[PDB]
Amino acid sequence: SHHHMPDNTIQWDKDADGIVTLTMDDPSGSTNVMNEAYIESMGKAVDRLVAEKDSITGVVVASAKKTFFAGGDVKTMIQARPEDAGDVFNTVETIKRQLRTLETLGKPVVAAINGAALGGGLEIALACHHRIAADVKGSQLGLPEVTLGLLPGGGGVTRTVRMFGIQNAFVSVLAQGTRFKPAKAKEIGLVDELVATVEELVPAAKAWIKEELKANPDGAGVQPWDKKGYKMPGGTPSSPGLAAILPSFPSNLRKQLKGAPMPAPRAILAAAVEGAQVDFDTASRIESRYFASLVTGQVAKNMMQAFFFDLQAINAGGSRPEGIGKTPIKRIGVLGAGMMGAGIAYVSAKAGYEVVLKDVSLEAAAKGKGYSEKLEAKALERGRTTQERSDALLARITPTADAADFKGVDFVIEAVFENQELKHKVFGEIEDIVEPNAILGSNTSTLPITGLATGVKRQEDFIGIHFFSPVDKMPLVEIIKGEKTSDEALARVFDYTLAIGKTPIVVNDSRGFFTSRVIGTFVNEALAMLGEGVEPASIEQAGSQAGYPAPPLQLSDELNLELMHKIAVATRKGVEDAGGTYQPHPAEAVVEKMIELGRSGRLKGAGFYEYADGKRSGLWPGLRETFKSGSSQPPLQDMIDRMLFAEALETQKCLDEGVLTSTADANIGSIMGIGFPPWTGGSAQFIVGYSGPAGTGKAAFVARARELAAAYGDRFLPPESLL
Amino acid sequence: SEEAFIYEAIRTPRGKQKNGSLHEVKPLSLVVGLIDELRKRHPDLDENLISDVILGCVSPVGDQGGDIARAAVLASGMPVTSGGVQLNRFAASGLEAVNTAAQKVRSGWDDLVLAGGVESMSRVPMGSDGGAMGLDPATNYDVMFVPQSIGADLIATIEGFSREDVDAYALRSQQKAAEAWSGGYFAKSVVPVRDQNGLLILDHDEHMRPDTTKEGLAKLKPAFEGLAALGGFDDVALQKYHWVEKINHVHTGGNSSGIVDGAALVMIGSAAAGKLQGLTPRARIVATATSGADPVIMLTGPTPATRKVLDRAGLTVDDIDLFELNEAFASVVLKFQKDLNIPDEKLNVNGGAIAMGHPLGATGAMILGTMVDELERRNARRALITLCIGGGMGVATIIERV
Amino acid sequence: SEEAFIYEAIRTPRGKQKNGSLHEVKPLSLVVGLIDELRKRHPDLDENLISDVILGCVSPVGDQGGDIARAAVLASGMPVTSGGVQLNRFAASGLEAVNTAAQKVRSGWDDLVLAGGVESMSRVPMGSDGGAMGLDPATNYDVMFVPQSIGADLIATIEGFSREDVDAYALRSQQKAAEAWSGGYFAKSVVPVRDQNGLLILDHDEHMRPDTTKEGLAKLKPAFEGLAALGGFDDVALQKYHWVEKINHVHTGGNSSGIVDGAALVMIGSAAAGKLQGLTPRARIVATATSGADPVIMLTGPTPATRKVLDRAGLTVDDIDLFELNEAFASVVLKFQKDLNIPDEKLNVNGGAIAMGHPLGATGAMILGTMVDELERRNARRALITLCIGGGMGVATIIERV
């Protein structure tokens, strides 16, 4: 059966030549989504193709939205419990039964791809026999289900493996959910032909059908894997060539994932190889059973919550003041041409903003523009950009060594040294020089915005705009609200972050803000374990297997260890000045000892690792004797959980204290800002989604936290807001 | 009770992998040649009393498929009632066949059994049969599959065995294998392979390099370094062994077992069966044991298996006169020796697979018969035979001279 | 002594060859599913006491290569000390695993063992492993290789079993298999196969044709007539059986065993091991035997093996309450019945492979567990389980209800 009283989303049209045009046009939305309306509408359309097959000679699948077809229904997939595995299995089997029938009609079926075809969208086009894509800018084609903790369950795994073989389909298409430009898709083989405009798609599809029927009548509408002499590219698992390298596919995957508990890539590879061992229809059903295994799991719900719902609530303005309007930005003034300022000047000019990059010397200001040159040249050779885009935007960056040159600027972003006395004078020398209602942003990681704001006259326009290095690659912007920061200033900066294509979060002024404070608990746990006698190799493995992109001791070498020392000094000046006794973290002792030994990280030549000409080497051999590494061998999960729970608990405190206003900003801010493991869905989602030997959810998190506190210190006791 | 005794133990010479003397010889012919030799030694034995023929074989495909033990029963003219069963427990297959045969004798339901193995690696290479543990991604990913060679490098890394240490053991193996051949230790158990005309094909273990120098082993390249980096198996192994930062790749072709062809046969029976056939018992199977250890490092099975068979026999390490552990990789032997504090003078005294080769399915039966001869040659009492096994398994056997 | 007892015996349903429910299921998953079921039944049993896992498998290649028993030990989370060994004795492999496990228990060197088999013939077809007896001309020519089906037609020719006779037995098998399912005889031992989500894949033996008619079997074409004339195997068989002029080809797909997927598992241990683990013994292994008969006709092994195990146990045909012989071909069962004068009411009482299928490596363990249930269901005493084996081999086992 091709069915599971909704609206209809597919329009039928048969011309005099017998070619049917299925135009997908869901009325309940702006894009075509694989919802219940689609499953019923495609069911009727496929039934009618079979019934009227005596008067049908070809089919053209088209769309009426800006985009071809965009994935599945996330609002339904996220609610699938393990007891709903039968309903999930039946649903994707029904979807693929329709596509398989469309695929074996004995007639050519052409996909007319006008816009984006992502996930279920591309899977529909993969079920056709010929794909034509409009070479329009912004047209993405790919199978990004792995990024949501899912797999392409509508035949994406089965068909791409049939087209490309196990190795190419997994590495290039499936494992990372890569999105492809239309020219890229034509090169790899996802699309067969290109047209300049969307208006040429359907006529080219009808032209191709007429030519295919004349030239190749015997094989018209027959996929290559449905012919008797089909040979899978790269071979099947039983051929000697593939079977020689096949045992290295899970190991390389395990190496890429660093042992992190992300089950979707494992399932994709299992389904791809098990499917290549059997016939197409049996392979498709195997793919359905692995898909249900992912949807009913917790990790896919975490990623759907973060990378779909939380990210959409942020891009919609959940943290934007709900009353303000628009204010343009005519010129941007960047103070400091270091790693931060030069990158900030790049992404701002990349969006077309005029920049006056001010540094003390014109030679350093030119070197700040040179950071854009090395990026403009490396991006040119890769052919990503070329035609005057780099050159014109590089011309928008105007270096300057004079404070007077920052005239007419209505948006200041200071990215100089984190010293309040310095920033007070730098802003004081500039506020009278720039526009009256100009935004006065300050890129800071620790210093509170309320204190910095007392150095300007119009404090209502002073705000914290924390970027992350490298500025061109990092997507998060942490906007810090000062006590005097107006809501209009927040809206103007919120709109700027979306203009430079970055994701914003809004944070109220507090020590360490959200990102710096929470990531502090991460490195402090690792440094505590090293002082406790835990092997440094185990600490780094625990960090990588937790899902972090960089192990903590390596991260502690990048963050200058001398910089970490004076951050603790700033905190000890907050409690000792208030009278209360400071309870120091035992990680501070480990920092001072490495400072005392002259190994303050990578910047000063050597830290927890050894370094040789900008190339990090192995761990310092003297580390084991210095801290007696090996005298403490706790379970690896305890090490992983101590790091994860420390950031999770600290995130809850930030939610209690009003540092963050929403769990969406917590989850996305933790993932995009401090590298929190994506499989968790965020530092706040990790609590509601924790799964361990205690159970699943907030209750299991609390018991495991109380268990960690009983064996490693009272800092792991959960707050009252979780109880 | 029904004790099980070894009445005969023989083997072929081991032929090397490249331009080997045995490459032209079907694996079936290797087994039949040994059956013919057993007929030469006891031409009046009633072969109807032989109830089974048990052959280990790690790659039972092609020439070695279709229950090669039954093919050997029929091709050699053995009685049609004499059985024939193939088994695979990786490197311990040849010893598992001996253990199974001895256990069938103790049960009272079999009286006289042939056990042994055959592996023609020049014709049917390792991994020819496939397998889920390696080729099935879900199984491979879950069990953290790491090829044996990298597990062997991991053992040397964990235990502190340097490149010179493992190369030192490899030299010792070449020396003792050369001394055993020169002294005629093997003359009565290595049955030369001949063709259908009686012409000699191979009479010695042609993988041996008796002129190996410590300096010549030092020039060899680590074999498993191109497999570990390009396959990511190092990172898989270290995720399990997270306290080890780096894997030291000490193993090469000169300190690992050689890839060779060969077969072995052992005759096992009860005391009544041997007396009835005029056979003299050479040794008694004291006890057997199966155990295992972590399947990621793969090669630490011999120590639990040896301790289990020693507890079962009510014996200690000091009660054993000769320890024979297969030389799959040098670090496995050094590890086993450090685990149980084996006196170096008791360990692989006539050399091992590093010098003479390791024909997977046959090796266990080869090194068992090697121990029957050496116990008799030295007039010693007890020997312990064990092998490391892929997947982290372990098999050990204690024999007592009679 | 150390008697061996059966504590559990379970199996999967058998999935058919064409559009079968189990074609999407890896052979490894079939075994692990049964291991999981054994954990459901005794969740507090110490699995460290399990010393080995012995699995028969006739085509140990591809999905079934690389010692699938060790893969099952590791993939199921069983203790790393629990062994794992594959064996092949053709159709008797599943019963040879049970026999070997029982003999390891009697030896005293193993206390608790898993035995069984697995064969996914829809994924790894018969003959996928090759073999010298068929593919090596010298061996093939000397032993007069004749495929089993022609040996089965030869048995009917020699004994006078007509096309109607063998088709009559085939109908009886379909009826008794349908009555056994309808009466719930199999409900507690056939473990339904489910996917990784808990969803049902197969819960019944889908090869059965309960509506088979005598007239419908009469329309079937002799399967082995195109193989005998075009291959000349008829003339080979009649050179050995020179007093038979013509071979009557009576066997078809309707009176031969079906090609199916399936696995079986049996738990065997000593009385002390079962008492220590809180297990109740269901039956006792009385005796085992290996024998054989002429390898040209291939399928007359059950009669010598059955007579040998009966002499070993000190019993006669009249002392056995249930005879279970695998239904590879109808004429093999009729021959075995005429040889030993078996009362028809005792022979394959719940149906056999003709109706439910014959998954080579697993069948022996399936029909053994079938007999443990039926002895208990009827409150009978002794059962005898035997199978015909390619190459003319024979294996028989006597169990006694406890």
Curated annotation (Swiss-Prot), chains B, C:
Isoglutamyl lysine isopeptide (Lys-Gln) (interchain with Q-Cter in protein Pup) crosslink, residue number(s): K188
Keyword Acyltransferase (UniProt): yes
Alphabetical UniProt keywords: Acyltransferase, Isopeptide bond, Transferase, Ubl conjugation
Superkingdom as given in the UniProt entry: Bacteria
Annotated Gene Ontology cellular component terms: peptidoglycan-based cell wall; plasma membrane
Active site location: A91, H358, C388
Keyword S-adenosyl-L-methionine included in the entry's annotation: no
Pfam families named in the record: Thiolase_C, Thiolase_N
Gene Ontology MF annotations: acetyl-CoA C-acetyltransferase activity
PTM notes: Pupylated at Lys-188 by the prokaryotic ubiquitin-like protein Pup, which probably leads to its degradation by the proteasome.
Family matches, as InterPro entries: Thiolase, Thiolase-like, Thiolase_acyl_enz_int_AS, Thiolase_AS, Thiolase_C, Thiolase_CS, Thiolase_N
Enzyme Commission identifier(s): 2.3.1.-
PANTHER family from the UniProt entry: ACETYL-COA C-ACYLTRANSFERASE, BLR7806 PROTEIN
Protein family per UniProt: Belongs to the thiolase-like superfamily. Thiolase family.
Protein name, per record: Putative acyltransferase Rv0859
Protein's organism: Mycobacterium tuberculosis (strain ATCC 25618 / H37Rv)
Gene assigned in the entry: fadA
